[PDB]
Amino acid sequence: TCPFYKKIPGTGFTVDAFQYGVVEGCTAYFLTHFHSDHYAGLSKHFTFPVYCSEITGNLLKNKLHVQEQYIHPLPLDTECIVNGVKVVLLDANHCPGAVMILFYLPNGTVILHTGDFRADPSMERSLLADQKVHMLYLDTTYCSPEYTFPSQQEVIRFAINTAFEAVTLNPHALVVCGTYSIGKEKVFLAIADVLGSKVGMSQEKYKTLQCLNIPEINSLITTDMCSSLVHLLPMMQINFKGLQSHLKKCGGKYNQILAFRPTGWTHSNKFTRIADVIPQTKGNISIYGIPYSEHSSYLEMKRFVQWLKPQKIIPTVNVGTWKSRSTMEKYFREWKLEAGY
Ligand code: NI
């Protein structure tokens, strides 16, 4: 059965609620982004209206074969009317096509659902600045003070400098980057750009990336592995056995692998700066775990909420345990008392 935190009161709407069958009294199903814990349940047999971004709609049509007549893409930053309710989609700074949703209820309540997001001060100058929000459905993935991480910019600088140095030292080194969903494309694209290479990948991943509207993508990605020195592989193959085997497949073109695993957080962050990160090495294979997050850190999330001053917060992540819930509720109270709302 659908949980309460996926239902928008006073509407016929749900959010990211496709794995529960036909939800009672749902007239429109919203999808914030194309990640499997959120889209799980969609297919060519789905015949209810789905509301989403243009990019998410490309992925629905091409990857899951949802029929076009049921896909309702909305432009960002634009007031739209859905089943008589005004809505706006805003950029969530998560993966490509990821949105937050503002709902303007007929009785005057204003609700923001963040979907998955990485809070940023740039958001303080969208259509959010223009009115009060009464309820916030918040991505609380990293809602605990131990979750610090560097900016995306610092992490990309580290990866580019590391890859550029390694391949300059050894022109026969291969760089490999792990992936298992859309998101974090900047990792492999920035590395390929500094090395003057395209990124080689499977036909299926290349198809997924072509759905995204990324400018000059035919310019950075390819299915011809032979001509590329940056390869993308499934995250599951990013280990010593998987990479030894891949290296065998390249036919003596290469004699070393430098691999990257962009993780969310890892407890090395509590003791280590980005400058100080080192790889795991075995033989002629090195693996770097890099803290590239597409969710808010604790401090980024705190700042966003203290700026927005919602009257009620409803968490959407880590809700399954009483200890997690109570912990998060305590932080929300602190934030409110410290900010004065
Ligand atoms: Ni996500």
Residue written as token pair 């998955």 = 116
Phi, psi for 112 (deg, rounded to 5): -110, 125
Q: How far apart are CA 189 and CA 197, in angstroms?
A: 9
Residues of the chain within CATH 3.40.50.12650 domain(s) are 148-295
Neighbours of 146 (CB within 10 A): 10
Q: Angle, nearest 10°, between helix axes 298-308 and 322-339?
A: 50
Helix, strand or coil for residue 90? strand
Mapped to the 3 state alphabet, what secondary structure does 3-30 carry?
A: CHHHEECCCCEEECCCCCCCCCCCCEEE
Helix, strand or coil for residue 58? helix
Sequence-distant (≥ 6) Cβ neighbours of residue 24 within 8 angstroms: none
Pairing of strands 285-290, 230-234: unpaired
Q: How far apart are CA 241 and CA 239, in angstroms?
A: 6
Ligand 1 center–CA 94 separation, angstroms? 7
* Spacing of C-alpha 202 from chain mean position: 21
What pairs with residue 332 in β-bridges? none
Ligand 1 center–CA 116 separation, angstroms? 5
Residues of the chain within CATH 3.60.15.10 domain(s) are 1-147+296-341
Four-residue CA torsion sign, 9, 10, 16, 19: positive
Q: For this experimental structure, what is the resolution in angstroms? A: 1.7
DSSP 245-277: HHHHHTTTS-SEEEEEEE-S--GGGGT--GGG-
Are 84 and 65 in contact by the 8 Å Cβ rule? The answer is no
Please, is 155 exposed, middle or buried when counting C-beta atoms within 10 Å of its C-beta (0-12, 13-18, 19+)? buried
Of 177, 178, 223, 228, nearest to 202 (Cα)? 223
> For residue 308, what are its two tokens?
């927005």
Phi, psi for 74 (deg, rounded to 5): -115, 140
Please, is 284 exposed, middle or buried when counting C-beta atoms within 10 Å of its C-beta (0-12, 13-18, 19+)? middle
Residue written as token pair 């995306």 = 152
Ligand 1 center–CA 33 separation, angstroms? 7
Ligand 1 center–CA 337 separation, angstroms? 30
Q: How far apart are CA 58 and CA 164, in angstroms?
A: 34
Triad 148, 153, 159: Cα angle to 5°: 95
> For residue 290, what are its two tokens?
């890099």
Question: What's the CATH class of domain 148-295?
Answer: alpha beta
Phi, psi for 203 (deg, rounded to 5): -55, -40
For residue 184, which amino acid is it?
K
Q: Is the domain defined by 1-147+296-341 classed in CATH 3.30.540.10?
A: no
Ligand 1 center–CA 318 separation, angstroms? 14
Phi, psi for 257 (deg, rounded to 5): -120, 130
Ligand 1 center–CA 91 separation, angstroms? 13
Ligand 1 center–CA 15 separation, angstroms? 13
